[PDB]
Amino acid sequence: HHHHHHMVHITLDRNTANSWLIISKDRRQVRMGDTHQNVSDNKERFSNYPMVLGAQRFSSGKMYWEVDVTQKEAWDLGVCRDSVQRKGQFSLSPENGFWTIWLWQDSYEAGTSPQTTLHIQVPPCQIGIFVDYEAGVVSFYNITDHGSLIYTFSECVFAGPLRPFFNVGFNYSGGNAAPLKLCPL
Ligand SMILES: O=C(O)Cc1ccc(-c2ccccc2)cc1
């Protein structure tokens, strides 16, 4: 791909984070803590899952960023509407305002309803995310495999401002403690 020149500097929004997440001083890394991180509750925080939003809001244009997923067993990445549900149980789907892919139990899937199997020969250590607001496209790229395409959501109906979306996943196994990191431009 040739999307690198639309690179944007994403930072994480602490106020949206699940109360167990630990966000680095530079707001570029996030990991699951082993306990509540001693913050007050608020209506923005994701309650049920280890999720957090980027601070940036996009309503036009082309945007690109990269995320490091090295040695994680489980995670979700993509974009979502600014007005997605924060509290209780929900599925990641375009109907609910999410355009995402994930790793879970050694398989990669796109967050359609129902979910779509992804075909990845080279397990990615870094994922590139491209959004074309006007075209209604969200695309995912395998940076470890020379930028190969993972998945394209097309005919997207965003229906609002978009925010970068992250889930570091649970760590029931003891093998999923590693952080998500926003990679430098
Ligand atoms: O509205 C809901 O679906 C659940 C809900 C509502 C309010 C708060 C809340 C907690 C502490 C300070 C402010 C607001 C948390 C969850």
Domain ranges of the chain: 4-182
CA pair distance 66, 74, nearest whole angstrom: 17
Residues 6+ apart with CB under 8 A from 67: 77, 126, 127, 129, 166, 180, 181, 182, 183
Class of domain 4-182: mainly beta
Ligand 1 pocket residue status of 57, Cβ below 6 Å: no
What is d(CA 51, CA 104) in angstroms, rounded to the nearest whole number?
Answer: 15
Resolution in A: 1.3
Q: Cβ(142)–Cβ(150) under 8 Å?
A: yes
Assess whether the C-beta atom of 87 lies below 6 angstroms from ligand 1. Answer: yes
Tell me the C-alpha distance between 36 and 173, whole Å. 19
Solved with: X-ray
- The pair of structure tokens assigned to 131 is 């959004």
- Which has the closest alpha carbon to 63: 8, 11, 13? 8
Residue closest via CA to ligand 1's atom 7 equals: 43
- In three-state secondary structure terms, 82 is coil
C-alpha of residue 45 to centroid of ligand 1, in Å: 9
Q: How does DSSP assign 131-182, residue by residue?
A: EETTTTEEEEEETTTTTEEEEEE-S----S-EEEEEE----SSSS--PPEEE
